[PDB]
Amino acid sequence: ARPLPQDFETALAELESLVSAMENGTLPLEQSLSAYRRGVELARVCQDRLAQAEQQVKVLEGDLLRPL
Amino acid sequence: QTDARPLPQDFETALAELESLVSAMENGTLPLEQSLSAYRRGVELARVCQDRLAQAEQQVKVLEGDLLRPLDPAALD
């Protein structure tokens, strides 16, 4: 099975692309279930990367204010 | 007083500028007036970052919802 991207931008781009394929009404039942499993994994990667980024900004905000 | 240079509106550049202000603040060489100017720029920069993250998070949540929609059978009572 295909390796799963771990960076936000690639994961997001595959997720968008999986969604369109899902909505164009041409994926057989079985491919639709694969696309679903795949997209859950991709969305999880996107959210993990965003949580990391949120945390990094918070830490920077704290660091900015600390000297004041 | 206020830093009048245009404000980045993209996550990467705002984050990068934010890191440089933090570096400048935690060098202590900053007189008070410049610290406060650096702080306000800082808050504006962090706000761009937090806005873009919030939007990306919402975009991902919408995409998740769109993925699940075609797998919904017709509603029962």
UniProtKB/Swiss-Prot annotation, chain B:
One of its GO terms (molecular function) is exodeoxyribonuclease VII activity. Keywords: Cytoplasm, Exonuclease, Hydrolase, Nuclease. The keyword Nuclease applies. Its main location: cytoplasm. GO terms for cellular component: cytosol; exodeoxyribonuclease VII complex. It holds the Pfam family Exonuc_VII_S. The keyword Ion transport does not apply. One of its GO terms (biological process) is DNA catabolic process. InterPro entries: Exonuc_VII_S, Exonuc_VII_ssu_sf. Its EC number is 3.1.11.6. It is an enzyme of class 3 (hydrolase). It catalyses: Exonucleolytic cleavage in either 5'- to 3'- or 3'- to 5'-direction to yield nucleoside 5'-phosphates. It is found in: Cytoplasm. HAMAP family: Exonuc_7_S. Belongs to the XseB family. Heterooligomer composed of large and small subunits. Bidirectionally degrades single-stranded DNA into large acid-insoluble oligonucleotides, which are then degraded further into small acid-soluble oligonucleotides. PANTHER family: EXODEOXYRIBONUCLEASE 7 SMALL SUBUNIT (PTHR34137:SF1). This is Exodeoxyribonuclease 7 small subunit. The gene is xseB.
